[PDB]
Design a protein around this ligand. Structure first.
Ligand SMILES: [Cl-]
Ligand SMILES: [Cl-]
Ligand SMILES: [Cl-]
Ligand SMILES: [Cl-]
Ligand SMILES: [Zn+2]
Ligand SMILES: [Zn+2]
Ligand SMILES: [Zn+2]
Ligand SMILES: [Zn+2]
Length: 52
């Protein structure tokens, strides 16, 4: 699944990147720890607001 990284995660992604990762890894680790959020149009839109 495509995610938006909110924080660097060594070996997987850097803050700001939008990229595909393993679904299990996103669900059980990234989302659970606030390291990334799902890349959906609603989320991208919301994140741009929160950055501004
Ligand atoms: Cl998925
Ligand atoms: Cl770095
Ligand atoms: Cl990377
Ligand atoms: Cl970086
Ligand atoms: Zn999937
Ligand atoms: Zn970094
Ligand atoms: Zn990268
Ligand atoms: Zn948010």
């Amino acid at each position: 699944m495509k995610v938006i990284f909110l924080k660097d995660v060594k070996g997987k992604g850097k803050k700001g990147e939008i990229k595909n990762v393993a679904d299990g890894y996103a669900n059980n680790f990234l989302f659970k720890q606030x390291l990334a959020i799902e890349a959906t149009p609603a989320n991208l839109k919301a994140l741009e607001a929160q950055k501004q």
